[PDB]
Structure 1
Amino acid sequence: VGMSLLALISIFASCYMLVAARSKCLTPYALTPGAAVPWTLGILCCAPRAHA
């Protein structure tokens, strides 16, 4: 039980860190009426798939 719980905690922490890093990298692009840099769009998936 201890090992399983620790593994789940670590994997959740890593997933949260990835999501937060994505949000922090793509936050400034929704504060401008500009383009999303398809180069960055491919690597960093965002909610706008085709629009904007």
Structure 2
Amino acid sequence: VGMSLLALISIFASCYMLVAARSKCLTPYALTPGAAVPWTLGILCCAPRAHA
């Protein structure tokens, strides 16, 4: 149980911190009426799949 719980903590923390990195990298583009730079979009997926 201890090893399993530590493994779950590791995986959740890592995935959450990737999500935070995603939002921080993509945050300035949601404050301008600009393009998403498909080079960034393809590597880094976002909620807007096609719009904006």
Name the TM-score, length of structure 2 as normaliser: 0.97
Query: What is the root-mean-square deviation of aligned Cα atoms in Å?
Result: 0.4
Q: 1: distance between equivalents of 2:48 and 2:8?
A: 30
Q: 1: distance between equivalents of 2:13 and 2:50?
A: 30
% identical equivalent positions = 100
Q: Unaligned 5+ residue runs, structure 2?
A: none
- What is the total number of aligned residue pairs between the two structures? 52
Name the TM-score, length of structure 1 as normaliser: 0.97
Once superposed, which parts of structure 1, at least 4 consecutive aligned residues long, lie more than 6 Å away?
Answer: none
